[PDB]
Symmetry: C2
Subunit: 402 residues, 2 copies
């Protein structure tokens, strides 16, 4: 398809089937980096992402849109034809739904034995009858992986937000697909990847869970965003807003204690000279430290705290609100937030390409396409006649431009 | 170096410089999938991850350990010699710290012009003087990206946990390096990747922020893990634990309203017939729906709720605590949590390899290596004699096995 040549992934042919976040996020990341990415939508109903008023302009940019029933008759024939020249196929569905509907990996590899297939699901491509065919939900994936119980406040768990599991899972699919692609180039043989959302999130929540698995205890939840174990680490309230800080180091602790009214605790058997970290539960003065730190911070503006913490080399940062990002010096210098044109000629604002490739940078070349916008061109390219396409449309197996 | 041949990344030579999570997570992910990955540690002090009692056995498995001062004299020579046969180099540092110490991308490409270089920093390789040279911290990246301000409770922001920003950033680096690797196959030219942690997290926080950027409003924070906008979606407390649910669909809403005592609202102007989703802010009875739902769920055990929600086709799941994972049928069936031997010959439990590659699965072949364990072998492999190595050790430029 027509598009500029750019990025590390120029010339790569990616196709994805799925809606909302996880699957499409995986597929569209390839597009940020130069790939030719075809977004498959059902004929009767478009991707449900489209009901979101603004986000899709970001999450569907740089894409080509195909509307095809890939499971039925001529629509299935066309899909499998497309696979013959596709490098990577990404799909998000309810477990092994593709195989159940007749498109096994075997059938896919009949049409392209080099194909990299990435299956994104809530509970995996195989397992028990109870879980395997269940739908993928971000909150369910966090619930099932032990991620949800470790997020939130001491006595109130909460999911990570927004849709954190969908992004981790989609990103993993991208990563794994690029790894499999390397193997294809070395080897001439394709791959099937079973990305289960709960296994992705299981990995991401292991920092303390590894203690539980290995004779220790699981950590408690944070208290109001404070570190579960170490005093003076995490989220704090200043007079002026919120700050995050890391009270770490001999001098840092000595001088901070003096600031906050706790100089008398230095050189104590509980806080011996050379103390680098205050363990809030192991140290009897843990809670007292938090009391004095809260009180001192509540008295000072973020600008004041930042000035003092800079003298002491205590790492810290103001918690920025959404309205503060665009005008931030780093954001400005790096063009971290930019603008582009939608396909219907409106100005849209949002994050630039990330990350920044030096030699072959990504670019935004296309706004989000409309439902079935590129169907006619795609089907032509893979050998369908004008009549073939008309028949597909009239049968409800394809949709062309609005 | 000695290791089994397996995974999609068999034969690939990866080296990483960094400590703790972000950089090492990026590098080690290659090792999960079959790559030869060399973990660089300093000479006088080891990676600080090693102070963690259990996690490092997971986060450093399948790795080779090199202890070398890569910035000084003969240590720099040995490092740059290693680069000559290295496919990917991942480094996590304070902005352009490598360049400032004389190891620029240009110098790296002088030794290997094909080299893929991934730079992981908090704020980027370039920008302003105030931000560019700051240290990377998970909480700071969340604070600076607008991720922290949207997580937590209505009146209490909280960071995603644990170290969520480090994992996203690390994973992104793996993804981007693999993409750059693909391009090297065509051009024979390497690449430099500028991964700034805040830009990674900016992207992950866009779902609602895209409204703010484009004439709408930023979403509110969740209340006790409940959807910011839609009633009956998100986290709820039952009699004997927590569940997540999605109140979506005509019959689902109708029958749930009846269960909870709100039958009289069905067919009103506020909740017309055929309503599929309750917008909690736009619907005058949104808060009322929550009250009644909270009340009904509080009365019932999770077993009872799931039974009822199965009847009604309302998607839901128990929020599992960490002790409930190992014996779960899906975990059991998929071997999601497995066991392996540490190099001290102890049994270690933790997550299996993810995701599951069908043709070329990853495997655990090695426990976490000790400080400088493979220094001698690595240096011998790149042409150093026993005497060359001994001189490096005496000069404090390298450490060999314990």
């Amino acid at each position: 398809l027509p598009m500029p040549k750019f990025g590390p992934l120029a010339g790569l042919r990616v196709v994805f089937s799925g809606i909302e976040i996880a699957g499409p996020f995986a597929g569209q990341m390839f597009a940020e980096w130069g790939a030719e990415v075809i977004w498959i939508e059902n004929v009767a109903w478009a991707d449900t992402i489209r009901v979101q008023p603004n986000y899709p302009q970001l999450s569907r940019r740089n894409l080509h849109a195909l509307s095809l029933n890939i499971f039925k008759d001529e629509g299935r024939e066309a899909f499998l034809k497309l696979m013959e020249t596709t490098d990577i196929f990404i799909e998000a569905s309810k477990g092994p739904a593709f195989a159940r509907r007749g498109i096994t990996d075997e059938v896919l590899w009949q049409h392209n034995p080099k194909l990299v297939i990435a299956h994104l699901s809530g509970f995996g491509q195989y397992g028990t009858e109870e879980y395997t065919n269940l739908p993928a939900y971000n909150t369910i994936a966090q619930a099932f992986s032990g991620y949800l119980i470790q997020n939130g406040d001491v006595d109130q768990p909460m999911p990570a937000f927004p849709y954190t599991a969908d992004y981790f899972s989609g990103l993993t699919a991208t990563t794994a697909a690029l790894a499999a692609l390397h193997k294809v180039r070395e080897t001439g043989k394709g791959e099937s990847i079973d990305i289960a959302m709960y296994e992705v999130m299981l990995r991401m929540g292991q920092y303390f869970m590894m203690d539980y698995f290995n004779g220790g205890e699981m950590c408690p939840r944070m208290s109001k965003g404070k570190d579960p174990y170490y005093a003076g680490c995490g989220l704090y309230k200043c007079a002026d807003g919120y700050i995050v800080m890391e009270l770490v180091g001999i001098t840092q602790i000595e001088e901070c204690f003096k600031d906050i009214g706790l100089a008398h605790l230095l050189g104590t058997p509980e806080i011996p000279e050379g103390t680098q970290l205050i363990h809030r539960i192991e140290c009897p003065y843990g809670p007292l430290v938090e009391e004095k730190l809260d009180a001192w911070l509540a008295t000072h503006t973020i600008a004041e705290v930042k000035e003092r913490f800079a003298e002491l080399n205590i790492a810290c940062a103001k918690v920025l609100t959404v309205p503060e990002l665009e005008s931030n010096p780093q954001y400005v210098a790096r063009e971290s937030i930019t603008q582009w044109q939608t396909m219907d000629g409106r100005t849209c604002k949002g994050p630039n390409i990330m990350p920044k490739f030096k030699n072959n940078p990504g670019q935004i070349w296309r706004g989000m396409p409309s439902h079935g916008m590129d169907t006619a061109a795609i089907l032509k390219n893979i050998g369908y006649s004008e009549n073939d396409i008309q028949e597909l449309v009239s049968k409800g197996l394809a949709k062309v431009e609005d």
